[PDB]
Design a protein around this nucleic acid. Sequence first.
RNA 1: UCCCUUCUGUGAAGGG
Length: 299
Amino acid sequence: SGVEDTKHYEEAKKCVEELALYLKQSVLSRPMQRKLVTLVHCQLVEEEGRIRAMRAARSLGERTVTELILQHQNPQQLSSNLWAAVRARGCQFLGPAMQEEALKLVLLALEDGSALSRKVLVLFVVQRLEPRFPQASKTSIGHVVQLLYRASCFKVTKRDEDSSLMQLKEEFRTYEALRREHDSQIVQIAMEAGLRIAPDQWSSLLYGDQSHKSHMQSIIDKLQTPASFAQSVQELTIALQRTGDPANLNRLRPHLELLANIDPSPDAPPPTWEQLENGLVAVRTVVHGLVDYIQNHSK
RNA sequence: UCCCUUCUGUGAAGGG
Ligand SMILES: [Ca+2]
């Protein structure tokens, strides 16, 4: 029974060659092409080719779900929606300049291991920030602290029938470390609100420039876990009942899911020829589906 | 990115 093997091989290679026609006035987005190139390049004969290709398919299915969601998303209302989410968590981003200055003041207060009550921390920062930023208030600054709180940046030490005492955990006693956990927390709030936001836009939102794209990219990369693919599918699937699904993206669901149940972890077992074929058929289907949606059902 | 108060908040309670 090695004819089955060869025919699986042939069908897989056919799938990849068929998607290769998209390369390349290209219909596909800038990253999607990239992932496609990585997919065309796996040599399926080679075992590193089969496992790589398998995960390249899972990845390409990832980006397909993302892009599809990005259509269903209002670009002008993106930042308003983000900041809306942030304020809904009792947090607030005061803007890049002020936020940087505020975080540094928090650090000025707490890098040497000091423990302060929340009230006193807020007061410290307000008193020192209002001279350069007249806007500053206990309310708004309290919102910045609450953002660091929700980030689990504090060792909080309770005092019976009194205010708690807060210390910066030692791993966060430098501006770099702190600003990373801060920013990462904002990114998470973006994710729980279901918003997709490109690294360039993140650099814009949090820094007022474009020189922080790789940093943000790293944050988004570190937040990535396998389980997200499936629930992102979930998100899209309920976004399609707010639509009635005119383009019938629903037809993609079973392939997307097959792609989702692929294990992307290394040392995960190599695929059988029938898994290789089913996976590459699935990806061929969904990328075609993406292109159909973009070109034929947009605005 | 309405604003401000209060609070021990992975957040609540109220004002303009
Ligand atoms: Ca008391």
